[PDB]
Ligand binder design. Structure first.
Ligand SMILES: C[C@H](CCC(=O)NCCS(=O)(=O)O)[C@H]1CC[C@H]2[C@@H]3[C@H](O)C[C@@H]4C[C@H](O)CC[C@]4(C)[C@H]3C[C@H](O)[C@]12C
Ligand SMILES: C[C@H](CCC(=O)NCCS(=O)(=O)O)[C@H]1CC[C@H]2[C@@H]3[C@H](O)C[C@@H]4C[C@H](O)CC[C@]4(C)[C@H]3C[C@H](O)[C@]12C
Ligand SMILES: C[C@H](CCC(=O)NCCS(=O)(=O)O)[C@H]1CC[C@H]2[C@@H]3[C@H](O)C[C@@H]4C[C@H](O)CC[C@]4(C)[C@H]3C[C@H](O)[C@]12C
Ligand SMILES: C[C@H](CCC(=O)NCCS(=O)(=O)O)[C@H]1CC[C@H]2[C@@H]3[C@H](O)C[C@@H]4C[C@H](O)CC[C@]4(C)[C@H]3C[C@H](O)[C@]12C
Lengths: 321, 321, 319, 318
């Protein structure tokens, strides 16, 4: 998985979901008066409305990622083995399951400071949604129109990082990803001067030589470096449309095509879908592996207590002339 | 620029056009009885029909790339400094300008073997279309449903290479590009064994580790290696639609986004358009930097002697629910 | 800097000293009855004798690295910005200066377990030797014949890591250096199979294709990966002499030649000396930038004994 | 294998010999009146003297590398599959075995231009020294005190390149090795500025970040790049002694240690010896995998003079 923010004409948050299979993902709107039940905390009958991508099970929205009516976003990304969910409750903490964590923050917080304040009081508990849907190790990107934080809950506790670049992938831990960038300082968007030696006339027979050393593989570290280089150098858009266009191109640079990454099951890991939330206009834009055409759904914060779902089109929608 | 072939349910040929501006590209269908005039050879009044992408100037189709009604494809890709157009006519060769070369081959040839016959007899001449459209250095991929060749006309002569992988980018010369793959033999689609040393317990905390080493930059050699890796390991599809989808994902792994590749003059190189020709069904599929949605145009049976054009639309066509 | 251990026919510990100038490095034997004086701790009149490399200022042995009579070895390597030296004394700790740290451990400790329990009680304090020899930030490799530890005193406190590979360079911190090896698991001593794709006939026109991916530069992370690869795959020696020879070849893989690493000052960082200590036979073997010939000095009570380095190339001229 | 040149106070030429065993290498002086016998050409009774490294077999000097009394150098380096030895004689050429090739050039040529002219007239014939010592594909660096050329005899003919950097390893062919440097133009001897982006605070916690991207393996292309970088950036010496010290440091950056490069047979490739020839003083310095101390022999009969290489660590005990 790769999650990014982008600051342009509007402000953006979105992700690639990289898995061996789809899980029946769909757009889920959770309205202000859908009652959020928690395993070890008091129900919330009144909260911020959410739009996100996930699955519904037992009438519960299980989000991969979502935003709320205030343009606060959150995404869960794979964090295998490093994630630690506590088998003990905590007296003066909010005891919340991984699968409740997005509803817990996005339901109640308007921005990243409020989100940080609530995470500081959290105890993530090792309770599965069900026997059929056991817990996976995750970390989180929480983003508003201004800034983002990374939440990693490991054996050493609840770790909250200011994300200075608005980039997250998978393992290793965030300080390791940020440190790993340092060895790529010499990369450039333009042709380098010959610093190798002026005793040999080295020639340039094409463009893009300043990039030489950027990794091209789909390991999480390589995707972290590549997404950061692509995002931080990406040209500004004149319009929101150009920003959304640029957002999909950036996610495109770290996309996993079917065949290059074969899991232990023999199944290829691929980018199941890509999305771009316009935080200011509370609009979800998404593409899927099977369909290039961008789909848009807007969150109207109106009321209701029923989850509203829109299934994914998993056919290539071609303009035939 | 990147050009590729793919063998699936049908058989495909197509390219990324990488440039810092748009020429106002369009689909151009040249019918059978559109008369091809040549600066230094006899006119061809009856020939194979073409569908491709480029511009029309003085009612002449200037193809960037095209196919004919037999499923033979030809693409011109940037080859600066290495391309050599002759200041001499040769009495025992066909004297053909670079801009006539696609009409010359696709108008007259049904397969790669016949294209090879005409290229063996060709002398590309240093004669420009017009003042506003000067000659720039090109090399070509010629492809049918079975195979492909690379034509490089340099100071040392007319070079034809069998293309064992169906991949072409820019400089360097094809023998150099193919030799440069040899160093990447150790790359893998799967998590490799620890061959570093069994004296240290090296851990794997994510998928995609076997690709570590694959270059990620947009230099022509890095794109050559990355296109080759992505294409040769691409998963098979069970439909033509899945092949077309997969084709655009492969071209996406080597696409240039606005801002990562900046020239001396400060121009931002980007992937202006991506296309996929179905050679068996004679159908062009394309996308633009500005529009993710695939557009399709079939070459139908004649009749006509007039060029038929479909201008590229450069606006994001979003599906709004 | 690069420090390594090697377990062969004997057991070995040694290092490259990488700097932009020579301090006049020499062999220094601190005999058992040389009195070690500390700025904030009681003196040690009777201790383990030490043999090492460094300089003498004010009749004090300023060791770069050394071993004691028990074959316990300690080397200080550059650790800029991460090293923390305390401006406070501590009642419940030993208050030792960085330049005192090698004498404090090696003078009193015969093995790594004893070194570790003594380091667990240390408070490294922010006191320079002189105006003309101020504190540079360091981390330490401590090695006996069985195993080795890394000591990093930083702002988060006194970190002691088991060293499963017997390798140390400079920044970053040890957990970072070790994690950084994971991405090189694919490297090999043998010609790999074509795993890129069986649909293209990739040719091998030379030996050594399995190491493609190994970093060649003199950055501290690159030297860590390359020393690890070269050390773990180095052929066994049949003798002690062959183990020594292999040791100098291993340090040779990550040596800095003059010209390839130009500092902020504009001076060339270079391997001033390479050494190999035989822990079991208490012997110091060393080479210098200027002199390829290996020099050997054995440890076997009052005054420092010194042997200056030759900075001339000692060439066996036949006729 | 890696061969280099170096121009400083004097002028130098030398190489690592990378192999998975030792032939029993030795210093060989061939005096001016040792008779050079050839399989298909007239013998030479009187010629320029040579000092170099090789083996003697059938009382013949089989040079791995050598220089002559004019400080013209020539080394043979592994060039497997690419080397083309002709099966036919050619009357308008000199018909010369690869193993005769060094004696042939260094015997008669004073400088690089004269070696060029003689090489131009050459046909390298496919005759083995003996059944015990069969042909192996080789290419050649020929250096004097001013410049070097590369001789690669392939299926497309006798190729001579000006070597602008004074570097040679193995495969690939020279134009490919030279083109391959272009992608390293961004490498530096000093810490680079952050060109990655002005929007992230990338930190430098050590020296040598400029070299990141330099290949560290012992493949022939990686050694070509690393030997080029090391050599072209190496600091100037103030004396001949400092130059020779620098030469071996340079050969050191690309040497092969036992265990990192295992061949087809499971044999360990390693740098059997390293040598620096001072061309102006006609002196051979050499080291061995087993002996770090430098050994030296100057080029001052009709019999070969030989000095067996020592494969023992000559240690200065204090
Ligand atoms: C400029 C194009 C090549 C792209 C390029 O220059 N690359 C930039 C650097 S990189 O990619 O990022 O490496 C080439 C490809 C096809 C060319 C066009 C076609 O060949 C058709 C005609 C041919 C005429 O001779 C000239 C005008 C022209 C209309 C050409 C103009 C231009 O040279 C084009 C559009
Ligand atoms: C099986 C998936 C993880 C596979 C994995 O281990 N990834 C390795 C990638 S890498 O090494 O980091 O490269 C996880 C990741 C996200 C998970 C889903 C999401 O977290 C959302 C809900 C959460 C509910 O608790 C369970 C159902 C579920 C719909 C989850 C099912 C499943 O456990 C998923 C799909
Ligand atoms: C084996 C040596 C080259 C090293 C090598 O094989 N390394 C492999 C590097 S790579 O795969 O190309 O990457 C070569 C270099 C010089 C050669 C020798 C000299 O040229 C002298 C004679 C010449 C005779 O023709 C054959 C025997 C011989 C005694 C040669 C034996 C062998 O072919 C040597 C020693
Ligand atoms: C300067 C040396 C290390 C620095 C270096 O150049 N490393 C390069 C690697 S990088 O930058 O981290 O990348 C260190 C190693 C051991 C140190 C010396 C020894 O500890 C002995 C004394 C101790 C005194 O406190 C200071 C003077 C001194 C004589 C020290 C001077 C300097 O601090 C030395 C010589």
């Amino acid at each position: 998985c790769t999650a990014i923010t982008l600051n342009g004409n509007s402000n953006y948050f979105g992700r690639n979901l990289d898995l061996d299979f789809s899980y029946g993902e769909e757009v889920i709107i959770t309205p202000a008066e859908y009652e959020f039940k928690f395993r070890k905390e008091k129900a919330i009958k009144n909260h911020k409305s959410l739009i996100g991508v996930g699955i519904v099970a037992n009438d519960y929205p299980l989000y991969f990622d979502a935003i709320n009516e205030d343009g606060l976003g959150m995404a869960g990304l794979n964090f295998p083995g490093n994630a630690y969910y506590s088998d003990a409750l905590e007296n003066d903490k909010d005891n919340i399951t991984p699968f409740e964590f997005i509803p817990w923050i996005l339901g109640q917080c308007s921005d990243v400071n409020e989100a940080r304040n609530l995470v500081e009081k959290i105890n993530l508990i090792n309770l599965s949604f069900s026997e059929q849907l056991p817990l996976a190790g995750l970390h989180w990107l929480i983003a508003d129109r201004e800034k983002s934080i990374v939440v990693e809950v490991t054996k050493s506790g609840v770790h909250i990082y200011d994300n200075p670049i608005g980039i997250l992938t998978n393992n290793p831990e965030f300080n390791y990803q940020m440190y790993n960038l340092n060895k790529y300082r010499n990369l450039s968007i333009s042709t380098p001067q010959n610093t190798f030696s002026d005793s040999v006339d080295l020639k340039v027979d094409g463009t893009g030589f300043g990039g030489i050393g950027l990794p091209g593989d789909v390991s999480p570290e390589s995707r972290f470096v590549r997404a950061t280089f692509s995002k931080l150098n990406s040209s500004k858009g004149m319009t929101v449309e150009e920003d959304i266009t640029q957002f999909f191109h950036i996610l495109g640079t770290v996309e996993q095509i079917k065949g290059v990454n074969k899991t232990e099951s023999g199944k290829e890991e691929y980018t199941v879908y890509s999305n771009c939330y316009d935080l200011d206009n509370k609009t979800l834009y998404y593409t899927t592996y099977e369909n290039r055409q961008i789909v848009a759904v807007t969150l109207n914060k109106k009321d209701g207590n029923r989850l509203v779902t829109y299934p994914f089109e998993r056919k290539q929608i071609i303009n035939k002339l």
